[PDB]
């Protein structure tokens, strides 16, 4: 999945992405609201890029069992959820 | 499940309550933090009581497909989540 450089403002649904292994969202300057429980079906997600985006908080991601890359550079994230440590 | 009139302060874990049909937490004066996804396994919770408790927010409830009673009296909930309307 790749929606880079889009003007996305709201990401409110919860996708059925069981097979997704790569997700990019670089250069979304207005995307700041994300649905809690967005990553429930993303167990196989390996690359996640919320870079250059306007989110201040990230949905909990205990279901991201296989994630290996996670970039949040140039974003307004103020605290990183405790689920990441597991 | 009934833990009413207790001095519970934190409810963070997500239980495995598949068969549960009742949750009672009346008169918990200090319980104010509840982790999101707490009601994930409550696919059959029919009665849910958070009364005389100190919560100001409620976890996501998309999995409450069969809930028929929900009491939140005497609690500091300031806004009610949009997932309730479905």
PDB file of C-alpha atoms in Angstrom:
ATOM      1  CA  UNK A   1       0.000   0.000   0.000  1.00  0.00           C
ATOM      2  CA  UNK A   2       1.316   3.436  -0.931  1.00  0.00           C
ATOM      3  CA  UNK A   3      -0.516   6.752  -0.644  1.00  0.00           C
ATOM      4  CA  UNK A   4       2.604   8.940  -0.376  1.00  0.00           C
ATOM      5  CA  UNK A   5       2.559  12.686  -1.158  1.00  0.00           C
ATOM      6  CA  UNK A   6      -1.230  12.817  -0.944  1.00  0.00           C
ATOM      7  CA  UNK A   7      -3.217  15.532   0.820  1.00  0.00           C
ATOM      8  CA  UNK A   8      -5.027  12.959   2.984  1.00  0.00           C
ATOM      9  CA  UNK A   9      -6.693  14.631   5.964  1.00  0.00           C
ATOM     10  CA  UNK A  10      -8.571  11.805   7.707  1.00  0.00           C
ATOM     11  CA  UNK A  11      -7.958   8.052   7.975  1.00  0.00           C
ATOM     12  CA  UNK A  12     -10.992   6.826   9.900  1.00  0.00           C
ATOM     13  CA  UNK A  13     -11.813   3.316   8.666  1.00  0.00           C
ATOM     14  CA  UNK A  14     -10.295  -0.015   9.718  1.00  0.00           C
ATOM     15  CA  UNK A  15      -9.038  -1.955   6.675  1.00  0.00           C
ATOM     16  CA  UNK A  16      -9.083  -5.711   6.127  1.00  0.00           C
ATOM     17  CA  UNK A  17      -5.374  -5.795   5.222  1.00  0.00           C
ATOM     18  CA  UNK A  18      -4.460  -9.335   6.280  1.00  0.00           C
ATOM     19  CA  UNK A  19      -1.900  -9.852   3.497  1.00  0.00           C
ATOM     20  CA  UNK A  20      -0.381  -6.350   3.555  1.00  0.00           C
ATOM     21  CA  UNK A  21       3.355  -6.429   4.268  1.00  0.00           C
ATOM     22  CA  UNK A  22       4.270  -2.809   3.449  1.00  0.00           C
ATOM     23  CA  UNK A  23       2.541   0.524   4.122  1.00  0.00           C
ATOM     24  CA  UNK A  24       3.810   3.995   3.145  1.00  0.00           C
ATOM     25  CA  UNK A  25       2.318   7.374   4.081  1.00  0.00           C
ATOM     26  CA  UNK A  26       5.181   9.855   3.571  1.00  0.00           C
ATOM     27  CA  UNK A  27       4.435  13.514   2.838  1.00  0.00           C
ATOM     28  CA  UNK A  28       0.838  13.595   4.048  1.00  0.00           C
ATOM     29  CA  UNK A  29       0.969  17.090   5.572  1.00  0.00           C
ATOM     30  CA  UNK A  30      -2.658  17.186   6.754  1.00  0.00           C
ATOM     31  CA  UNK A  31      -3.239  13.604   7.950  1.00  0.00           C
ATOM     32  CA  UNK A  32      -3.463  13.972  11.735  1.00  0.00           C
ATOM     33  CA  UNK A  33      -6.453  11.836  12.808  1.00  0.00           C
ATOM     34  CA  UNK A  34      -6.243   8.048  12.574  1.00  0.00           C
ATOM     35  CA  UNK A  35      -8.798   5.470  13.641  1.00  0.00           C
ATOM     36  CA  UNK A  36      -7.928   3.709  16.878  1.00  0.00           C
ATOM     37  CA  UNK A  37      -7.459   0.032  16.157  1.00  0.00           C
ATOM     38  CA  UNK A  38      -6.303   0.787  12.612  1.00  0.00           C
ATOM     39  CA  UNK A  39      -3.522  -1.824  12.806  1.00  0.00           C
ATOM     40  CA  UNK A  40      -5.703  -4.686  14.093  1.00  0.00           C
ATOM     41  CA  UNK A  41      -5.559  -6.605  10.798  1.00  0.00           C
ATOM     42  CA  UNK A  42      -1.945  -5.611   9.976  1.00  0.00           C
ATOM     43  CA  UNK A  43      -0.255  -8.572  11.698  1.00  0.00           C
ATOM     44  CA  UNK A  44       1.990  -9.199   8.671  1.00  0.00           C
ATOM     45  CA  UNK A  45       2.843  -5.509   8.136  1.00  0.00           C
ATOM     46  CA  UNK A  46       6.638  -5.218   7.969  1.00  0.00           C
ATOM     47  CA  UNK A  47       7.303  -1.622   6.846  1.00  0.00           C
ATOM     48  CA  UNK A  48       5.351   1.318   8.274  1.00  0.00           C
ATOM     49  CA  UNK A  49       6.127   4.940   7.363  1.00  0.00           C
ATOM     50  CA  UNK A  50       4.177   7.771   8.963  1.00  0.00           C
ATOM     51  CA  UNK A  51       6.835  10.246   7.863  1.00  0.00           C
ATOM     52  CA  UNK A  52       6.399  13.979   7.242  1.00  0.00           C
ATOM     53  CA  UNK A  53       2.825  13.624   8.490  1.00  0.00           C
ATOM     54  CA  UNK A  54       0.807  15.626  10.999  1.00  0.00           C
ATOM     55  CA  UNK A  55      -0.234  12.917  13.479  1.00  0.00           C
ATOM     56  CA  UNK A  56       0.355  13.736  17.136  1.00  0.00           C
ATOM     57  CA  UNK A  57      -0.629  10.290  18.450  1.00  0.00           C
ATOM     58  CA  UNK A  58      -0.392   6.753  17.104  1.00  0.00           C
ATOM     59  CA  UNK A  59      -2.992   3.985  17.515  1.00  0.00           C
ATOM     60  CA  UNK A  60      -1.914   1.099  19.718  1.00  0.00           C
ATOM     61  CA  UNK A  61      -0.218  -1.636  17.724  1.00  0.00           C
ATOM     62  CA  UNK A  62       0.071  -4.810  19.809  1.00  0.00           C
ATOM     63  CA  UNK A  63      -1.192  -6.705  16.743  1.00  0.00           C
ATOM     64  CA  UNK A  64       1.911  -5.724  14.739  1.00  0.00           C
ATOM     65  CA  UNK A  65       3.701  -8.982  15.539  1.00  0.00           C
ATOM     66  CA  UNK A  66       6.000  -8.979  12.496  1.00  0.00           C
ATOM     67  CA  UNK A  67       6.792  -5.266  12.089  1.00  0.00           C
ATOM     68  CA  UNK A  68      10.511  -4.627  11.587  1.00  0.00           C
ATOM     69  CA  UNK A  69      10.675  -1.031  10.288  1.00  0.00           C
ATOM     70  CA  UNK A  70       8.850   1.991  11.715  1.00  0.00           C
ATOM     71  CA  UNK A  71       9.638   5.580  10.699  1.00  0.00           C
ATOM     72  CA  UNK A  72       7.924   8.634  12.207  1.00  0.00           C
ATOM     73  CA  UNK A  73      10.390  11.375  11.252  1.00  0.00           C
ATOM     74  CA  UNK A  74       9.272  15.002  10.868  1.00  0.00           C
ATOM     75  CA  UNK A  75       5.965  14.341  12.659  1.00  0.00           C
ATOM     76  CA  UNK A  76       4.299  15.892  15.695  1.00  0.00           C
ATOM     77  CA  UNK A  77       4.105  12.651  17.691  1.00  0.00           C
ATOM     78  CA  UNK A  78       4.561  13.753  21.303  1.00  0.00           C
ATOM     79  CA  UNK A  79       4.495  10.410  23.135  1.00  0.00           C
ATOM     80  CA  UNK A  80       5.041   6.930  21.758  1.00  0.00           C
ATOM     81  CA  UNK A  81       2.567   4.303  23.013  1.00  0.00           C
ATOM     82  CA  UNK A  82       3.781   1.637  25.425  1.00  0.00           C
ATOM     83  CA  UNK A  83       2.620  -1.191  23.144  1.00  0.00           C
ATOM     84  CA  UNK A  84       5.733  -0.619  21.014  1.00  0.00           C
ATOM     85  CA  UNK A  85       8.009  -2.004  23.746  1.00  0.00           C
ATOM     86  CA  UNK A  86       6.421  -5.462  23.356  1.00  0.00           C
TER      87      UNK A  86
ATOM     88  CA  UNK B   1     -18.256 -10.643  36.269  1.00  0.00           C
ATOM     89  CA  UNK B   2     -18.833  -8.459  39.319  1.00  0.00           C
ATOM     90  CA  UNK B   3     -16.175  -6.353  41.037  1.00  0.00           C
ATOM     91  CA  UNK B   4     -18.532  -3.664  42.341  1.00  0.00           C
ATOM     92  CA  UNK B   5     -17.838  -1.542  45.441  1.00  0.00           C
ATOM     93  CA  UNK B   6     -14.106  -2.164  45.086  1.00  0.00           C
ATOM     94  CA  UNK B   7     -11.371   0.468  45.242  1.00  0.00           C
ATOM     95  CA  UNK B   8     -10.064  -0.480  41.780  1.00  0.00           C
ATOM     96  CA  UNK B   9      -7.781   2.229  40.402  1.00  0.00           C
ATOM     97  CA  UNK B  10      -6.483   0.801  37.111  1.00  0.00           C
ATOM     98  CA  UNK B  11      -7.990  -1.659  34.609  1.00  0.00           C
ATOM     99  CA  UNK B  12      -5.340  -2.095  31.921  1.00  0.00           C
ATOM    100  CA  UNK B  13      -5.300  -5.729  30.790  1.00  0.00           C
ATOM    101  CA  UNK B  14      -7.467  -7.008  27.948  1.00  0.00           C
ATOM    102  CA  UNK B  15      -9.287 -10.124  29.207  1.00  0.00           C
ATOM    103  CA  UNK B  16     -10.237 -13.280  27.326  1.00  0.00           C
ATOM    104  CA  UNK B  17     -13.936 -12.932  28.214  1.00  0.00           C
ATOM    105  CA  UNK B  18     -15.543 -14.817  25.326  1.00  0.00           C
ATOM    106  CA  UNK B  19     -18.493 -16.273  27.266  1.00  0.00           C
ATOM    107  CA  UNK B  20     -19.130 -13.295  29.566  1.00  0.00           C
ATOM    108  CA  UNK B  21     -22.657 -11.870  29.484  1.00  0.00           C
ATOM    109  CA  UNK B  22     -22.444  -9.367  32.380  1.00  0.00           C
ATOM    110  CA  UNK B  23     -19.919  -6.806  33.649  1.00  0.00           C
ATOM    111  CA  UNK B  24     -20.587  -4.876  36.866  1.00  0.00           C
ATOM    112  CA  UNK B  25     -18.272  -2.128  38.143  1.00  0.00           C
ATOM    113  CA  UNK B  26     -20.600   0.098  40.179  1.00  0.00           C
ATOM    114  CA  UNK B  27     -19.141   2.142  43.044  1.00  0.00           C
ATOM    115  CA  UNK B  28     -15.516   2.031  41.899  1.00  0.00           C
ATOM    116  CA  UNK B  29     -14.598   5.583  42.962  1.00  0.00           C
ATOM    117  CA  UNK B  30     -10.976   5.563  41.745  1.00  0.00           C
ATOM    118  CA  UNK B  31     -11.152   3.498  38.535  1.00  0.00           C
ATOM    119  CA  UNK B  32     -10.540   6.091  35.814  1.00  0.00           C
ATOM    120  CA  UNK B  33      -8.082   4.529  33.330  1.00  0.00           C
ATOM    121  CA  UNK B  34      -9.250   1.754  31.009  1.00  0.00           C
ATOM    122  CA  UNK B  35      -7.182   0.467  28.108  1.00  0.00           C
ATOM    123  CA  UNK B  36      -8.593   0.663  24.599  1.00  0.00           C
ATOM    124  CA  UNK B  37      -9.574  -2.704  23.192  1.00  0.00           C
ATOM    125  CA  UNK B  38     -10.758  -3.853  26.623  1.00  0.00           C
ATOM    126  CA  UNK B  39     -14.126  -4.876  25.149  1.00  0.00           C
ATOM    127  CA  UNK B  40     -12.574  -6.698  22.174  1.00  0.00           C
ATOM    128  CA  UNK B  41     -13.499 -10.181  23.427  1.00  0.00           C
ATOM    129  CA  UNK B  42     -16.937  -9.111  24.739  1.00  0.00           C
ATOM    130  CA  UNK B  43     -18.849 -10.442  21.719  1.00  0.00           C
ATOM    131  CA  UNK B  44     -21.726 -11.409  24.008  1.00  0.00           C
ATOM    132  CA  UNK B  45     -21.631  -8.883  26.892  1.00  0.00           C
ATOM    133  CA  UNK B  46     -25.283  -7.993  27.479  1.00  0.00           C
ATOM    134  CA  UNK B  47     -25.161  -5.922  30.693  1.00  0.00           C
ATOM    135  CA  UNK B  48     -22.405  -3.376  31.334  1.00  0.00           C
ATOM    136  CA  UNK B  49     -22.442  -1.099  34.386  1.00  0.00           C
ATOM    137  CA  UNK B  50     -19.913   1.685  34.946  1.00  0.00           C
ATOM    138  CA  UNK B  51     -21.729   3.738  37.580  1.00  0.00           C
ATOM    139  CA  UNK B  52     -20.370   5.921  40.385  1.00  0.00           C
ATOM    140  CA  UNK B  53     -16.956   5.486  38.763  1.00  0.00           C
ATOM    141  CA  UNK B  54     -14.306   8.041  37.851  1.00  0.00           C
ATOM    142  CA  UNK B  55     -13.788   7.310  34.139  1.00  0.00           C
ATOM    143  CA  UNK B  56     -13.880  10.259  31.749  1.00  0.00           C
ATOM    144  CA  UNK B  57     -13.623   8.207  28.539  1.00  0.00           C
ATOM    145  CA  UNK B  58     -14.768   4.829  27.265  1.00  0.00           C
ATOM    146  CA  UNK B  59     -12.787   2.274  25.216  1.00  0.00           C
ATOM    147  CA  UNK B  60     -13.817   1.367  21.673  1.00  0.00           C
ATOM    148  CA  UNK B  61     -16.922  -0.808  21.557  1.00  0.00           C
ATOM    149  CA  UNK B  62     -17.273  -2.086  17.975  1.00  0.00           C
ATOM    150  CA  UNK B  63     -17.189  -5.665  19.307  1.00  0.00           C
ATOM    151  CA  UNK B  64     -20.216  -5.088  21.573  1.00  0.00           C
ATOM    152  CA  UNK B  65     -22.570  -6.608  19.001  1.00  0.00           C
ATOM    153  CA  UNK B  66     -25.127  -7.859  21.548  1.00  0.00           C
ATOM    154  CA  UNK B  67     -25.010  -5.260  24.341  1.00  0.00           C
ATOM    155  CA  UNK B  68     -28.510  -4.232  25.436  1.00  0.00           C
ATOM    156  CA  UNK B  69     -27.897  -2.339  28.703  1.00  0.00           C
ATOM    157  CA  UNK B  70     -25.223   0.282  29.391  1.00  0.00           C
ATOM    158  CA  UNK B  71     -25.326   2.426  32.541  1.00  0.00           C
ATOM    159  CA  UNK B  72     -22.863   5.287  33.059  1.00  0.00           C
ATOM    160  CA  UNK B  73     -24.635   7.316  35.756  1.00  0.00           C
ATOM    161  CA  UNK B  74     -22.660   9.420  38.251  1.00  0.00           C
ATOM    162  CA  UNK B  75     -19.490   9.217  36.134  1.00  0.00           C
ATOM    163  CA  UNK B  76     -17.247  11.920  34.683  1.00  0.00           C
ATOM    164  CA  UNK B  77     -17.591  10.785  31.046  1.00  0.00           C
ATOM    165  CA  UNK B  78     -17.490  14.046  29.100  1.00  0.00           C
ATOM    166  CA  UNK B  79     -18.252  12.751  25.598  1.00  0.00           C
ATOM    167  CA  UNK B  80     -19.668   9.456  24.431  1.00  0.00           C
ATOM    168  CA  UNK B  81     -17.782   7.548  21.709  1.00  0.00           C
ATOM    169  CA  UNK B  82     -19.216   7.475  18.190  1.00  0.00           C
ATOM    170  CA  UNK B  83     -18.945   3.673  18.001  1.00  0.00           C
ATOM    171  CA  UNK B  84     -21.971   3.495  20.319  1.00  0.00           C
ATOM    172  CA  UNK B  85     -24.383   4.657  17.603  1.00  0.00           C
ATOM    173  CA  UNK B  86     -23.762   1.486  15.556  1.00  0.00           C
TER     174      UNK B  86
END
